[PDB]
């Protein structure tokens, strides 16, 4: 089967119990709820239909909450009509949010435009459609020299490549969505426009302040500032989502492929889950089959090493959402089956988990059984891309859902684990029940014995 996990953004056409039941059947693993739109009654009902489907069907899934996040936007123009800009003209941005725009001026929502920017910096409007150079800055106006032609519309996003922007890490609306996340008991939170480590902690504080300590934080990297602080941002998050489309607006186009690859590699080396997202199968919002391009992009993303691939509009609003998940599952299976283990890499956990993967492959073990509380143990084996499927045994309900996103992982919640010998017994029974192994197969069993929950130190080889 496939090992790479599929995040599906759920929307009006896919929030029914009947659809979610088939969305999982087709390969969906994590439900994404995009709070950029929708209201608390909408999502809470979507959450309920899934937990209804899971309870009745017996399948497992995770639920991810994604924040709107901070952003800079233009506003309206006179007559609400587009305006055509010409290169070389002088253009001006104003802080005054009460101004209606025109061909010489438009208003912006963030006052720190003047302080953060400096003469020589570039300003990009509407996903980089129109670019401009800042030539002078005065009070409540920002003077620019237009660099390229384009049609400016109303309420368009603005980007400042290579510039340290001083936005708040979260908007006030974000704070309320996060709190709703804690009340619902969500498993993951993906936070938009994370630029620096301080941003990651502020979310962690807020979740800690409302019972979201056991919630894993997924930081979305979207610009060069985030990329520049990526190492620190990874250290502070529980995982990463690579938002390739947005970064493409911020950095040289040929670096994006090497930005995604590095980040995947660094998440792998760190035993932290990674999602590759945006411009995945966009051509399928309207079409029943994807491009040659889209599938190859996805296939290179799995070969880079990502844990998960994410469907956005394709599944929340698309006209062929079920076909999108299904073909994604076909791409993942086809791509996952020709990848090899990565047995390189002094922690005790690292030495033990890496050796167990080599031993699994040295014995053609179809399954590596892992006892985990917080999930680090299943993620330590995953770093080595084992051919074996990882059945992770836990009593912690959150852990089981969160491992739904880790590559190659099959979570199974169990009542209790009393000792090291019990783990081997219980795991042996369950290895047969899971159907992934059979009598006569070898399994490798990883646990921590007489050590804290944070370390993995034991490896044992059993026959089923």
């Amino acid at each position: 089967m496939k090992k790479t996990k599929i995040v599906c953004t759920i929307g009006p056409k896919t929030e029914s119990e009947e659809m979610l039941a088939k969305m999982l059947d087709a390969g969906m693993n994590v439900m994404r709820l995009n709070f950029s739109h929708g209201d608390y009654a909408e999502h809470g009902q979507r959450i309920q239909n899934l937990r209804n489907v899971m309870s009745k069907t017996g399948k497992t899934a995770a639920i991810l909450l994604d924040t709107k996040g901070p952003e800079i936007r233009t506003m309206k123009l006179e007559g609400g009509n587009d305006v055509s800009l010409k290169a070389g003209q002088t253009f001006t941005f104003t802080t005054d949010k009460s101004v209606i725009g025109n061909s010489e001026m438009v208003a912006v929502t963030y006052e720190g435009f003047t302080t953060d920017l400096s003469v020589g910096n570039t300003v990009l409007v509407d996903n980089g459609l129109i670019g401009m150079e800042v030539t002078a800055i005065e009070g409540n106006k920002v003077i620019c020299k237009v660099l390229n032609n384009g049609d400016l519309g109303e309420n368009k996003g603005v980007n400042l490549p290579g510039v340290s922007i001083a936005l708040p890490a979260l908007a006030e609306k974000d704070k309320q969505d996060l709190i709703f996340g804690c009340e619902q008991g969500v498993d993951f939170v993906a936070a938009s426009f994370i630029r620096k480590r301080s941003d990651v902690i502020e979310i962690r504080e807020h979740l800690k302040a409302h019972g979201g300590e056991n919630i894993h934080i997924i930081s979305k990297i979207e610009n060069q500032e985030g990329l520049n602080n990526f190492d620190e941002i990874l250290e502070a998050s529980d995982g990463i989502m690579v938002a390739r489309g947005d970064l493409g607006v911020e950095i040289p186009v040929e670096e994006v492929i090497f930005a995604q690859k590095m980040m995947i590699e660094k998440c792998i080396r760190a035993r932290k889950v990674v999602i590759t997202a945006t411009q995945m199968l966009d051509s399928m919002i309207k079409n029943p089959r994807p491009t040659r391009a889209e599938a190859g992009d996805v296939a290179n993303a799995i070969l880079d090493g990502t844990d998960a691939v994410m469907l956005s509009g394709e599944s929340a609003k698309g006209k062929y959402p079920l076909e999108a998940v299904s073909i994604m599952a076909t791409i993942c299976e086809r791509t996952d089956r020709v990848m090899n283990s990565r047995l390189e890499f002094l922690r005790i956990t690292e030495a033990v988990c890496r050796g167990a993967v080599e031993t699994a492959e040295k014995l053609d073990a179809p399954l590596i059984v892992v006892a985990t509380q917080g999930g680090k143990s299943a993620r330590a084996v995953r770093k080595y891309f084992p051919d074996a499927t990882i059945l992770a045994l836990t009593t912690n309900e959150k852990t089981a859902h969160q491992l739904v996103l880790s590559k190659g992982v099959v979570p199974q919640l169990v009542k209790e684990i009393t000792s090291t010998d019990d783990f081997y017994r219980l795991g042996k029974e369950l290895a047969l029940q899971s159907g992934l192994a059979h009598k006569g197969d070898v399994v490798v069993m990883v646990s921590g014995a007489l050590v804290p929950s944070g370390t993995t130190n034991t490896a044992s080889v059993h026959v089923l």
Copy 2:
């Protein structure tokens, strides 16, 4: 200095002496001539303008001719207006070329349409826009049931995924173009829609018959039949072109990307050139910048190991030919400078060449100087992706040109090389003259000594 080579299809906007020179300044190495269109006055002019540009400046490049080839196409419709075909409807193809089409029946260009097809096959019209199922075949009619809605127009290509097609290897015009190739001294010949080894052999007989025995044939793989027989085609060809676009229609969408990787890998091991083509940076036909998607696709083909990447419309019929090349060349460098040698893989030529690269690397040699007659020696080294640049000294002007298409090779024509010790003298001098090495650097020099051409047997180390 990039190692990957760029093929550019030259057209009206890029056929000037002044422009071609600016394409070469920008990194162009090979001129492609797409003989689907244009006439002998047009093509002969491009060849002359290049040789004028080459003659005056001293830069060197290659000339590749790309054939139209055999094909199956629809014909004209009533009133020359589009007709909408509906899923479930019955549609029919006819052999009678004087029949006007309609919503229920159209004429085809291939008379063997009925005999080649069988009950159950899929028929695709206009690059897969509309697909149909064959339901019956009788005489001069082909009966089908339409599977998807779309407008069938005039002059639309026909594709038979998973179906073995029995067309001829050359059209009468193909025969006339190749002879013009022989007459003009083309360096390469690209052969479209290669399905079997016999297709390549037919071309070789043709080319040998007009004094172009030394002209390299690069087989373009364009359907599922070619892919099944790829191994035999490579043996008979001099190289391969991966046509990702055309294969995208003939084979399941999740297989295409691995067909590229597989096909490229075998070209490397065989010491035969491989080009990745079609759907490179198409969007630059209209836009002055590529998408993030394209540049990741292109560069990942370089990481696969491709020798050369090809521009089609971007440089033939496009608005931004210089911008297309430059971003291509910048992608080649950004990608090439992070790729490593591949020093695995009982022959003499290989053992010496693999040893020469490993020695050069262990001694921080910037350069491998190679004495070659037909270039087989330069292409044996290239297999291992050496960090060091290859200075290929030859007395055969065709080889000097043909070796411009291979990755990392800087060819140099010489008056003579009388002996092995003579080669070391001259090769050391020319290494310094090129500016690619400097006094004191280590250079590694590979030649055949006291053996006929085609074998490389000697490897030597000098300080400049």
Copy 3:
């Protein structure tokens, strides 16, 4: 500090409790009893004196019983006088044991002398002093032509190089000596003159019938036939003793060094103990310091990989018993400490035991703690020449004694181990009690969990 173990033949000057105590202080590990000489009261007394010192001191050791074995010997001469034989003369051996010899004929003790030999064989008398070539065989006589001059004495041993001899596998006296071995509870039994597997099985039967199922058989390979069947013999024994001296008499002198090197390496591979003996430090029978050569021979034995090195007369019938053992311990200490682990060379037991040693080195673990019943698991670790010391915890007292002979092993007997977590608890306490580890050191612990005795499947890393 040393890892190689020292076997000592104990004799009149070293059988007192006061000596045994100082021999262990000097490095002795195993006592050997040469049943070639002595009677049941002497050997039984040595066993008692050692076990008294063990009881008083708390030190541990093993008891090895070495058999006389079968043999072919000359017999009595006229007047008990030496006779001089001359090269070229005819000499005759007779089966008639009532014939008194002289310079033309002597009797032998083995009735099969006439049948086993053939015309052309070599006959060697008195440790190779005198050689003869068989020229004819008639009735009860073997006729020979003497090849070199020498003095034939009374009761001289005979060697028949390259001849398959039909002697019994055990002497009638041997049968009783082994029964005494069982009665006393010896740990090892070394069996002389093993030629074929059938010999080893007869010994195993004999031990079974008197309660010696737990006694390990150590087969002494002493002739060409022993060597030819070495595998068949090794498969059935629990170990090997290399009889260097006799091998010099049976096989070309250039092969003996390569018989030894093999036997050690194949014993290493089989997880079965190997002892190197004979011609070790003979010169210390009379002198207080060994040869330059002797010390070099002894050290190359340890480097080949032998588990233990053995002293004979040096410690049994000699003037400097403690000085010899002491210098032996100095050679072992000095030699062992520059030897390296061997991390090469399907089964489960092997995969884990090689991984535990590879884990131990990557973590600088000074000790590898093993729970073992029958000693196999502790011996499976040693196969890889671990830098670390092996602390083998067992409840089988015979195993605890027998494991004193395997290189690098420290036995410690315990009451019980009820489970895998219990094993880790106690092992950490007992690791520190031994003084071989300290707070902060890492230990690796090898066990069998939920499998029967004979398989090793679990390895675990703890910090003390």
Copy 4:
């Protein structure tokens, strides 16, 4: 055939042309001349019969001269009677060369005895037979306390363990022996009792000052002072001789075995010849067959990596010199056929010669042919212990002789070599004539091209 080379000390029973002829047929390669005894006419004549034998048959050998060297010896006793020394007694050595000795005091030949020695140092007389500890030093006498009983005889050697001895670097007679060496054109010189680099330099000055500039210095390591300065001594010398007998008396006995191995390895890494000498097959001075210990001591010296093994009294003054060499050859061979290459270890000669050997083995070439004038080229290849035999082609007659001592090297004198391509021509022809390779076999050819002598930079692979 064997690769290890044999040095033989030649004497009266082994100086006849007929016997030298039989010594070479049996495997003798280098003649040793021990200037401890004999006079210039005797040594000059042995030199003559060899160069006569070489010329007549065409078989080849080299000539080595061994110095007596400086030394400390006791002198004569009263009535020339042995005196019995007892443990604990006071004994005294005197500088006065006019004193006749007795049981309480004897004279020594070295004036610096009092100044070099110190209270607490050990004094050893007659192969370490009697040892004494200095208790006081006054005027020209050194007082001692004897440690063991023993009989002191006349004219006995003295050894001072761990003491920096300030004798001259050469004895006065040695200077004349070297001058005699320069006259005869000996190829090698063994210089005894080398303690420091300055010692080797005094010899080098002396040899050059009399025209022996191309004579190689083989420094004899015999005491602790040399060992501490070994690195410089090898660096300053042309090769090393391991004199195990002398070391056995000067340093702890368990260190001797590692002193041999270390020096053999370091000479290997330096591309400098190493001879292992003393206590090789001594038992054959009196016996026609060697000991198992001796057969193993030598065979382990070859496995250690020695270029040469040396016979002393065995071949100079013993009863079975011819049998000794033959069995020495049988051991060398039996061992030589089981050794493997050692292909580790960024200099140009190193990179190229190591690459040729792996390629030689990757193609099963039975021969590597090397072009050398100063011999460095063959000794760089030999270092990696190639299976292929090194056919070393040279124009320097001395070089051809000096390479007779180097392991696995077959020297060949040739008229001239006019080019690199000439070497390939001639080398292919001579490879076939030599009988070591045949038509269809691969040969690997190593030469230096367009560089000064001392550098090897070219490797070429040819079919015969």
